[PDB]
Each structure stands twice: as structure tokens, then as C-alpha cells.
Amino acid sequence: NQPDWADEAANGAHQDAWKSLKADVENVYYMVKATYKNDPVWGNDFTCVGVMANDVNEDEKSIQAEFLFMNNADTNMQFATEKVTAVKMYGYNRENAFRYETEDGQVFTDVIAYSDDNCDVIYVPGTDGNEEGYELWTTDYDNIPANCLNKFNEYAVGRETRDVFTSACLEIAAA
Ligand SMILES: NCCc1c[nH]cn1
Ligand SMILES: NCCc1c[nH]cn1
Numbered sequence: 237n238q239p240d241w242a243d244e245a246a247n248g249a250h251q252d253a254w255k256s257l258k259a260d261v262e263n264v265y266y267m268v269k270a271t272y273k274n275d276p277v278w279g280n281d282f283t284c285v286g287v288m289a290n291d292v293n294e295d296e297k298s299i300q301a302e303f304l305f306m307n308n309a310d311t312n313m314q315f316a317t318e319k320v321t322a323v324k325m326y327g328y329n330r331e332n333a334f335r336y337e338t339e340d341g342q343v344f345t346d347v348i349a350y351s352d353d354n355c356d357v358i359y360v361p362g363t364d365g366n367e368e369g370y371e372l373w374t375t376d377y378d379n380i381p382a383n384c385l386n387k388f389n390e391y392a393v394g395r396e397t398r399d400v401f402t403s404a405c406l407e408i409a410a411a
Contacts, residue, residue: 239349241349241350242332244329248330250351251328251332251348252331252351253332253333254297254322255351256348256356257289257299257320257322258289258299259353263288264286264375265286265374266373266374266375266376266400267285267373268377268399268400269372269398270398271396272360272368272369273367273398274366276364276366277338279306279307279309279314280307280308281307282307283401283402284305284405285303285305285306285401286303286401287302287304288301288302289320296321297323297331300318300319301319301336302315302317303315313405318336318337319336320334320336322334323335326347332347333347333348334346334348346360346371347359349370352384354375355373355385357371357372357384358372358373370388370391370392372384372385377402
């Protein structure tokens with residue numbers, strides 16, 4: 237059993253996990269929307285999630301990712317570092333998933349449902365002690381690409397979508 241969009245022949249061209257992970261090195265990615273409220277690491281009613289990477293390791297298809305996030309337990313922005321590795325899921329031959337590993341050794345494996353140059357639609361299977369659902373990540377939290385947004389809305393149909401990282405996360409400007 238696997239999601240109907242998890243068809244490598246049909247959709248693999250837009251499910252390149254390693255390319256998507258390496259993209260975190262040049263630009264910060266913001267999780268702009270999701271269909272679930274709680275994450276074991278980011279917290280409850282989490283918002284303002286962003287990520288940037290460094291230390292690309294081609295041999296391992298891994299990066300060291302630095303995250304920022306907020307939740308209802310603290311008014312201040314929170315930060316964490318996790319290793320993320322491009323791995324295979326759903327029988328794919330080319331890596332289509334992200335294996336996150338926290339400093340405490342906790343592992344989460346999420347799957348790229350759709351990805352374009354500056355945005356990703358990610359599926360959380362819900363088997364890592366977490367809620368099953370979808371996430372939408374983009375490099376510009378104010379200008380969301382239509383292709384990814386449409387794919388996110390298509391795959392996430394029947395759920396409750398909510399904003400995660402928005403301009404409300406920051407107090408921009410001066411005086
Ligand atoms: N471009 C990939 C965005 C992301 C989500 N999780 C880790 N990185
Ligand atoms: N779906 C996000 C799981 C995760 C990875 N790191 C922290 N939380």
C-alpha cells in the first residue's frame with residue numbers, strides 16, 4: 237500500500253529528494269502550510285518553521301540542517317540542528333524521501349510527493365509517532381509558487397490546511 241502519487245514512472249521527475257535537500261544550502265526553505273498541528277520535535281500548533289543547510293556529503297546524500305521554529309510553549313523562536321539524508325521509500329529507485337535524524341537519535345522519514353526548483357510538497361506517513369499529513373515548503377514565504385500550491389491542495393484534499401511560516405512570524409523593518 238502506498239499513496240497513488242507515489243508512482244515513480246509517472247511522477248519521479250518531480251520527486252528528486254537529493255536535489256531538494258541540496259537546495260536547502262543556497263536558500264532558506266520555509267514550511268508555509270501544513271495539514272497537521274503537532275510535531276514531536278517542533279511542538280504543538282507549531283508555526284514559523286524554516287530550514288537551511290550546509291555540509292553536503294555526496295557519498296551519503298546527507299546535509300546538516302539548521303531549523304528555526306515556534307510552538308505554543310514558548311514565545312521565542314526555537315532552533316535545532318538535525319541530519320537529513322535522501323533515502324528511498326515506496327520502492328523507488330531514485331531517492332524520494334527525507335530521513336531526519338535528531339541529535340538524540342530520533343528518526344523521521346517523510347516523502348517528497350512533488351518538488352520543483354523552489355518548493356516542495358512533503359508527505360508525513362504518520363508512522364514515526366506523529367500525525368499523518370502534508371507540508372508545503374517554499375523559498376519565499378510571501379510568494380508561493382502555483383505549481384506546488386496546486387499539488388499540495390490536490391494531495392491534501394479532505395483535510396484542514398493551516399499556515400505555518402508567514403510574515404506574522406517576523407517583525408520586519410525599523411522604528
Ligand atoms: N528543499 C527541501 C526543504 C526541506 C524540508 N525539510 C528539510 N528541507
Ligand atoms: N514532519 C516533520 C518531522 C520532523 C523532522 N524533524 C523534526 N520533525
